[PDB]
Amino acid sequence: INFTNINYYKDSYAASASRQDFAQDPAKFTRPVLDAIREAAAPLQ
Amino acid sequence: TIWYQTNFVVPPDTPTEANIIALGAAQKNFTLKLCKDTDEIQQTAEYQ
Amino acid sequence: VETILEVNNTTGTTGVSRLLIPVRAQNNVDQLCASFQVDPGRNGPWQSTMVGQICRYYTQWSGSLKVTFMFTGSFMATGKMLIAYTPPGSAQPTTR
Amino acid sequence: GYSDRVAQLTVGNSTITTQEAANIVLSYGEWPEYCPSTDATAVDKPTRPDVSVNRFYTLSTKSWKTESTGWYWKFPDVLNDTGVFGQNAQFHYLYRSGFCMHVQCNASKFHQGALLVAAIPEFVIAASSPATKPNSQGLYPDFAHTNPGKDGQEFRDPYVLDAGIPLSQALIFPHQWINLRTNNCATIIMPYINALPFDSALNHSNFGLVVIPISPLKYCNGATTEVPITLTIAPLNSEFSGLRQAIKQ
Amino acid sequence: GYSDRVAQLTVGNSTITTQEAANIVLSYGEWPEYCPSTDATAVDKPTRPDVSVNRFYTLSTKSWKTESTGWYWKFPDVLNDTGVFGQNAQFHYLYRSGFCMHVQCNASKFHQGALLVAAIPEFVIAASSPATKPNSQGLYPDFAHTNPGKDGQEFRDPYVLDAGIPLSQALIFPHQWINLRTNNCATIIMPYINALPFDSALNHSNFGLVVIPISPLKYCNGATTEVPITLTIAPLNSEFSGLRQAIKQ
Amino acid sequence: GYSDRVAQLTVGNSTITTQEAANIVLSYGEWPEYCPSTDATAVDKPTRPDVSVNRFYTLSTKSWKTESTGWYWKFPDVLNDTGVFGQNAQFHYLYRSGFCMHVQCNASKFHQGALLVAAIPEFVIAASSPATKPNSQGLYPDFAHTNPGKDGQEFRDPYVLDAGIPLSQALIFPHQWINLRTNNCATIIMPYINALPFDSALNHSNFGLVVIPISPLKYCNGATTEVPITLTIAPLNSEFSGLRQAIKQ
Amino acid sequence: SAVSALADTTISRVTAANTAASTHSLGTGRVPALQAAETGASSNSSDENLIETRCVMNRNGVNEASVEHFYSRAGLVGVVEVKDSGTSLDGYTVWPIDVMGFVQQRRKLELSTYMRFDAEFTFVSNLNNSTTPGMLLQYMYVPPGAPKPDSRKSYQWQTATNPSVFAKLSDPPPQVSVPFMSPATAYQWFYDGYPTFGEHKQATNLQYGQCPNNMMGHFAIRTVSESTTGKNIHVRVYMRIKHVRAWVPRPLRSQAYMVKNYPTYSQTITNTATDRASITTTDYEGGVPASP
Numbered sequence A: 001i002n003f004t005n006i007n008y009y010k011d012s013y014a015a016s017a018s019r020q021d022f023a024q025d026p027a028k029f030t031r032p033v034l035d036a037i038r039e040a041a042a043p044l045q
Numbered sequence B: 001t002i003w004y005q006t007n008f009v010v011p012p013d014t015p016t017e018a019n020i021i022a023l024g025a026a027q028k029n030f031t032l033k034l035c036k037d038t039d040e041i042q043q044t045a046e047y048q
Numbered sequence C: 001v002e003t004i005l006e007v008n009n010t011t012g013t014t015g016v017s018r019l020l021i022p023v024r025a026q027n028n029v030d031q032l033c034a035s036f037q038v039d040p041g042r043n044g045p046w047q048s049t050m051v052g053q054i055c056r057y058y059t060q061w062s063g064s065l066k067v068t069f070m071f072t073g074s075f076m077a078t079g080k081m082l083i084a085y086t087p088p089g090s091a092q093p094t095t096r
Numbered sequence D, E, F: 001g002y003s004d005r006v007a008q009l010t011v012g013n014s015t016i017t018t019q020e021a022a023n024i025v026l027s028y029g030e031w032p033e034y035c036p037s038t039d040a041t042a043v044d045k046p047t048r049p050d051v052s053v054n055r056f057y058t059l060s061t062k063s064w065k066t067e068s069t070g071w072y073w074k075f076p077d078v079l080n081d082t083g084v085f086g087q088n089a090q091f092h093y094l095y096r097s098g099f100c101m102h103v104q105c106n107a108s109k110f111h112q113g114a115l116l117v118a119a120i121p122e123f124v125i126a127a128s129s130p131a132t133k134p135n136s137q138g139l140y141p142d143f144a145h146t147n148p149g150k151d152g153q154e155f156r157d158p159y160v161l162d163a164g165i166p167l168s169q170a171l172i173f174p175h176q177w178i179n180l181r182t183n184n185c186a187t188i189i190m191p192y193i194n195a196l197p198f199d200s201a202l203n204h205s206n207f208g209l210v211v212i213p214i215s216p217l218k219y220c221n222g223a224t225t226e227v228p229i230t231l232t233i234a235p236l237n238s239e240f241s242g243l244r245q246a247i248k249q
Numbered sequence G: 001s002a003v004s005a006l007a008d009t010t011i012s013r014v015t016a017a018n019t020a021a022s023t024h025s026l027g028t029g030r031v032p033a034l035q036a037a038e039t040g041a042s043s044n045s046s047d048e049n050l051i052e053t054r055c056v057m058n059r060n061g062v063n064e065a066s067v068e069h070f071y072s073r074a075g076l077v078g079v080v081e082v083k084d085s086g087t088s089l090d091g092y093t094v095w096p097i098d099v100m101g102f103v104q105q106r107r108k109l110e111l112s113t114y115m116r117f118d119a120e121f122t123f124v125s126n127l128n129n130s131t132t133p134g135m136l137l138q139y140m141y142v143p144p145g146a147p148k149p150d151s152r153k154s155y156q157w158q159t160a161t162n163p164s165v166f167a168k169l170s171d172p173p174p175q176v177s178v179p180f181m182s183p184a185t186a187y188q189w190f191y192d193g194y195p196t197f198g199e200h201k202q203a204t205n206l207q208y209g210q211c212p213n214n215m216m217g218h219f220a221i222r223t224v225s226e227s228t229t230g231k232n233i234h235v236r237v238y239m240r241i242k243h244v245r246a247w248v249p250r251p252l253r254s255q256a257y258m259v260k261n262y263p264t265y266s267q268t269i270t271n272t273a274t275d276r277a278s279i280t281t282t283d284y285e286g287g288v289p290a291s292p
């Protein structure tokens, strides 16, 4: 029984840290290219 | 380690020495644990 | 994200020159080009990498690493390299 | 499942062709877009001079030498005095736009070297102080180094990007290499990145555009020595608001 | 409907890449296979050390010269003292395996020459006698010429394959050319060929692996003179039976 | 509902028969097993040399005397230099296996004495210091006492197992007695016990194998004096991963 | 009801990527190892395609590497001395709120270009000998434009609108949660520009890079006293960042900082990687080779 993530004040920014929304999307930094390259292919053909 | 499988062969009139650039990164199954404080930069006084 | 390894972190090498692995035409066969350890948090070539600098903010790491080598010679220059990763227990190999 | 080596970029009345191209970098996977009404704050109707300003501008050509350190530009600053774009940037208080930066450097199959072409958002230029404490003038860079104009500024310490950050990690930014054995151009499409929907094109420079030779240019006697590097850019989806008297700087 | 020039051979923990490859020769159209229970004769359960022995071994590098005659190896003999394969060949009486021989020789686009890479089953080496009748020692080749080890042995008379058979007909064997203008490697997958299901890896050599320069290596002054030839092989589907004390030879 | 006195243990090409056997101890009621994919951590494909290494090795024979204290071995260390198992332990970084330890000691119906055969996991050997404080060399045992090899090491103080723990409680470990009036052998099947799925067979010794005479050997004049004790072991479900150059120690 | 809400509050584990089993491949046209780093994209090569891997159902948790967990850790951001002895009998001090004064918090923050977050400020105040006698302190937050105090008795301490915290030294550290206060959408640790128009031909040019969207006023601290107390108080301000949003990651600073609000490195540039003897030396003795 967990009793946490409860806000005691009227303003929302007084709540604790929001640690339930882990998202991972590395494509925007690792593959920022237009023509998607397959792994098994020669990239420049 | 990097070894010469064969030689580095060039025709005439082209540089005989070149460079290899190494780019390191992590794979999809990379993970970190037990966040701590780094030891990269030191400080002896406040930056005022 | 792939970032440049500072493999040429030798004394005397300054500036951008520290990011280059020199390769040249050999007079003998089966010679050693360069070497480095693959411990990301260890003082060495991995200090210059984004993975190497974020690893220093954490105690323990796990997973496969990845090194991409880019040859920057002439279009006319050809060659073949053997890049070997030696698991723990052995020192740096002395021969190919 | 691969990328073709030939490419043609047509925007406005300009067209750029290349036959040895690596790819086209779409920075952070987002295309340039106009400000949505959900994110806008100014109430004046913006002007969108579609084809008169969104077009390729060939701005500066630097000669790559064996001891070159590199050069950098600031995107809004490099176009503030050219064409219809410069006028709209001078006549309007507010401005926003993406761009498509295209760096061109061709050499023979007997040359070698590699450039690092990166688009650095909020590229704050640092000054290197000679360990002087009392807040001397040499603690902050002059205006010629922060806003180089269209001629660009050559790096003093490319190893630290003239900003105290290591060059080796500059690949965290939208980047591309020009490896003379592989390709002769680098294309980066960059959307408008800023904490504000609009901003002044005169005070604030949204992006820094660096071109740094990692592997030095090397060739043998007899080859063409003058190997230029040309920077061509084009604003994309550029808007302007807050019309008033033209202000130079 | 054609063969690609690039190829990658992955077996065990080893991987070989090539970018100028002709094809891969599958000798006699049969893949290496384990001994079927219908053809086996020994009743002891064989050991199959899958990935510890079936892997690529880079063994010897010979320097191709303009007056080179060629070299030859014997397949089981060349691996009898290397790695986990050598140990299993020394600890077990019986052995069988195929292999994938890979010969590597790269040179510039300004060199020329062609090698003949062939895998000769039961390559019995002949001795050239000086017309001597009385069964002298010079009537049979010494052990250094029949089992050269990992260093290989250079041909004395490549025209007759050191066996009295004409070199011109050696193409009846599973072969491949290394033509410097076309490719830089030669791959031959060879199944276990023998009149017995198993055999001793120490006494009997199943295959001879020859590399003979038909068209001599020629280049002009200024090119790289040292042009090596590297032999990399890998056993396939290797079994061993009849365990006992390790026997060297 | 009982246990038969005769037994035969067949693994690999080895077979051990006994006609006066007590039982077979299955340590902690778990059989040796290969590492499940749920518990593995290394991504390299392991090698499983089934019958070449999983076989009985007769290693050492110690002579039981009336004033003997006992002997101990370390399981991975005692096989690191014998047979195909030793080679795979030297060529691979990672290793895991169970074993079936079999201690043989026969004597006439006119001899008497009892051995305690126990398999101690993580048998850390202690040094007995002569009450010396300043961290002298005599504070830690040398390598000959921690890794005795195949000859084993005879106990200095069997009463405390050379580890400061009382011998009387060593029966908390998987054990078996060799009571000369009852049986002449002791069999212990031990699964791989370690906090890691794999580990180095050279640095870490998973189990200590002790043979301690509790009731001393006694006989009358005329009986055979030389009463040997033979240790035969066999790895079970042994895997190896991380192939590299063979490392001795 | 809301019982289902409170039950689903434990940190749920999402594991790292699994590794699938793979085998050897002998053919042409399939080259997952060959890449083109010039395209600016990182290599998409997998382990499965370069070696023969096993099936590993990975169960290592990745939740600790999130931006929130990386930043939601209170670090020192300011040290304020309330001098009330010796030559400065002020009993009050007005500290300009700037979180770029200390390296550990600064380097972590500069990992990103823009950040939008709420903060939880904590004040650890004590005397020089680390003792905490009962002494009433007032920590008043002075937003940009509010009148700043100039003495321990001035009218600004009435705080009829300014938020103010009263706490003795002996109490547990005061702690308040501060919202995202900024005219912009996010705080901007790097502002490549100037705040005002003009020629910018000044000899110093100290205005370069100063974005007023980050300047959030001052923290006025005083001892609620009738006269001088003769005791100096040190207030350590700790900022814990919550509800974090980061944009445009940057290289982590490699040169030592020199000033608070500016990137400025010494002319003696330190290498990012420590030096070694040559390019072919590693300090790892390893084990004894079995057969050299």
Ligand SMILES: CCCCCCCCCCCCCCCCCC(=O)O
Residues within 6 Å of the ligand: G097, G098, G099, G100, G119, G121, G139, G140, G141, G163, G164, G165, G176, G178, G181, G187, G188, G189, G214, G215, G216, G219, G261
């Ligand atoms: C009762 C007293 C409470 C204190 C109120 C603190 C308010 C702090 C504002 C939020 C801090 C984050 C923004 C800091 C940005 C300035 C950094 C800089 O660019 O130098």
